[PDB]
């Protein structure tokens, strides 16, 4: 599924991501629009032979199973399958977990890049929330 | 399955540092985040803090800087210390997944001279 | 901090009948409320995760419900296993913080 940008926004608040551990809801808007384009088929393979999955491009590496990527853990305790579904409650679950580690949301890349220090709150303008 | 044991002493005095183990079985131990929280008489709980597999921690702002909770991969334990403990440090101590899927049993330590 | 207010601070039950209990937060805390038993001489049991998500192998009697600041534990035909503290924990913020519990009676 690609979700529209007020779409996305009203399944994130409604799934508890507005100011979730200091992080306004346009961040995570924000993000989802770098790493996946709102696309929660997304993937991509990275060189370690782990794969980034879904909405969020969760990597297989540290955070769910694919059964395909080496020395790998399985944090969110789930398959990377889950995290490519249309609902996206347990990618929202699993981001929690990881931006809840030290890190925050500096564990994506694309947020750091694009999203952090600039007004986020354009990616929530005019959304029905 | 994934079992949690506290351990430690039932008796610390003021001043000295408050040290308790947290013993888990299976194999999550360096996949998940690991809590020790503590309850006061009044059931009053307070959420202490956690370390995540990376090495991160997070410590409620109410215990100052007398906390660390650290992590040995290589024996599926991990620890509390608490600096500096005085009577109001008397509580019941738990370890438990971040998740809150998994719990010891609490273990009683009395601050007392 | 994120203050958690329970209520009300006990409910006496028939066994057979339903309750609720209130958790209400001091902020707004989305989805991000988690609600515990904890029966006397046992450690806390996770109940009901981000407040409405119900857990493997505990009772669909118990379901949760409620968003924003305020939120609802329902237990429909109690039994008398069931009594003991409720308590409600958010992880909006840290510091994570506790609600002052609910003691569930049994009433005879």
């Known amino acids: 599924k690609v979700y529209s940008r007020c779409e996305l926004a009203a399944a994130m608040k409604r799934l508890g991501l507005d100011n979730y551990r200091g992080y306004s809801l346009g961040n995570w808007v924000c993000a989802a629009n770098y790493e996946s384009s709102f696309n929660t088929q997304a993937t991509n393979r990275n060189t370690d032979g782990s794969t980034d999955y879904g909405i969020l491009q969760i990597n297989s590496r540290w955070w769910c199973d694919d059964g395909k990527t080496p020395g790998s853990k399985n944090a969110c305790g789930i398959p990377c399958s889950v995290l490519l579904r249309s609902d996206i409650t347990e990618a929202v679950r699993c981001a929690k977990r990881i931006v809840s580690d030290g890190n925050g949301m500096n564990a994506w890349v694309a947020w750091r890049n694009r999203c952090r220090g600039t007004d986020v709150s354009k990616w929530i303008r005019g959304c029905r929330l | 399955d994934v079992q949690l044991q506290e351990s430690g002493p039932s008796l610390v005095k003021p001043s000295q540092t408050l040290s308790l183990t947290c013993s888990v079985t299976?194999?999550?131990?360096?996949?998940?985040?690991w809590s020790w929280i503590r309850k006061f008489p009044g059931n009053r709980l307070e959420y202490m803090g956690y370390?995540?597999?990376?090495?991160?921690?997070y410590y409620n702002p109410s215990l100052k800087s007398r906390i660390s909770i650290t992590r040995d991969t290589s024996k599926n334990q991990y620890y509390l210390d608490l600096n500096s403990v005085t009577t109001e440090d008397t509580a019941t101590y738990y370890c438990?997944?971040?998740?809150?899927?998994?719990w010891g049993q609490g273990t009683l330590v009395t601050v007392s001279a | 901090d994120i203050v958690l207010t329970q209520s009300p601070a006990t409910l006496s039950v028939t066994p057979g009948n339903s309750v609720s209990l209130s958790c209400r937060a001091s902020?707004?805390?989305?989805?991000?409320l988690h609600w515990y038993q904890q029966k006397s001489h046992e450690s806390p049991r996770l109940l009901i995760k981000?407040?409405?998500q119900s857990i493997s192998g505990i009772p669909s009697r118990f379901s949760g419900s409620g968003s924003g600041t305020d939120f609802t534990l329902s237990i429909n035909s109690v039994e008398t296993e069931d009594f003991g503290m409720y308590f409600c924990?958010?992880?909006?913020?840290?510091?994570?913080?506790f609600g002052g519990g609910t003691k569930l009676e049994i009433k005879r």
């Open positions: 438990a997944n971040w998740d809150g899927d998994y």
């Open positions: 299976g194999d999550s131990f360096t996949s998940d985040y």
């Open positions: 370390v995540t597999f990376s090495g991160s921690t």
């Open positions: 902020q707004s805390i989305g989805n991000n």
């Open positions: 981000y407040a409405s």
């Open positions: 924990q958010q992880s909006n913020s840290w510091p994570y913080t």
